[PDB]
Amino acid sequence: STGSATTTPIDSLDDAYITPVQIGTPAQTLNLDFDTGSSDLWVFSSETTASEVDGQTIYTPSKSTTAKLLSGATWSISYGDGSSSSGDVYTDTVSVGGLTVTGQAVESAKKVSSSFTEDSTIDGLLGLAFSTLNTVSPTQQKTFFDNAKASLDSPVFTADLGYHAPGTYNFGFIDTTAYTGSITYTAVSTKQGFWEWTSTGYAVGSGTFKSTSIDGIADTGTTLLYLPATVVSAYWAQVSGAKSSSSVGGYVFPCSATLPSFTFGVGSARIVIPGDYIDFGPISTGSSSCFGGIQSSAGIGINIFGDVALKAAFVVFNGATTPTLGFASK
Prior knowledge:
Elements: E1 3-9, E2 17-23, E3 28-35, E4 41-43, E5 68-78, E6 84-96, E7 99-112, H1 114-117, E8 124-127, H2 144-148, E9 156-160, E10 167-171, E11 184-187, E12 196-204, E13 210-218, E14 225-227, H3 229-236, E15 243-245, E16 250-254, E17 262-266, E18 269-273, E19 279-282, E20 289-292, E21 294-296, E22 303-305, H4 307-310, E23 314-318, E24 324-328
Parallel strand pairs: 3-8, 4-7, 13-22, 14-21
Antiparallel strand pairs: 1-2, 1-10, 2-3, 2-6, 4-8, 5-6, 6-7, 9-10, 9-23, 11-24, 12-13, 12-17, 14-22, 15-16, 16-20, 17-18, 19-20, 23-24
């Protein structure tokens, strides 16, 4: 089997991407944030504290003939940005782009933090990291990908995120028309439960490539590119007037600037992030200070190849017995 679904930016800055997901019988379609940095499929629901729902579409398990309470199971998750959610668990039928999993754990939110409430466009998350990170207790649950894997034509999914435009998540096949050149594959460590890999270096603009190992995670659920302070300083030093602002919470730059590209290494291959992808616009409405898309990972504890980086590539998440990651230009 295979699946193919379009993923769409939630706003003009590509702050996140939503992908329609069918849950239950008859189908209830919710727009979920596919997150390769976590492993819980959770949704706004009929059980969510009413004051914490503001425009989201909710899953109502009582209206699904295939929903079953997973008795005794609860979940609770905290994300890197400080947001959180928790609740109980149903199993139900879940389909993405024509690919159906029966018996999928659907985590129903009883509580969500303010950032979720305040984002009316995201109805929940669909985790695509390794199932060892799943938070369901006392019986840990499998991700949608893990449940689908055996049935897939090939045990892979791909992320093809757009810049200010829709893109695609495919399951079970590699669309050879979706990228240019060849795909370069690189080793993955699953020790922390992430799609963790080591980049071979970077370049700023038309500058020379610096060979250096950068361990980080491929994370579709993180907006920006978070790298070591040395790398980030070297980038922003090439933008007149750019500076790190503690009051704003990272590097800002004059909105009048033209940003240089940023290249990262994947083995001997190179992925180029155009300068425009690194512009996240005015810090506040009407400001001439703009927020940067490359930020320091210092104090996160991990480097994160988030959407800014991933949307410059066609990315293969290979879930074979020994997982790997593939990157191609597009």
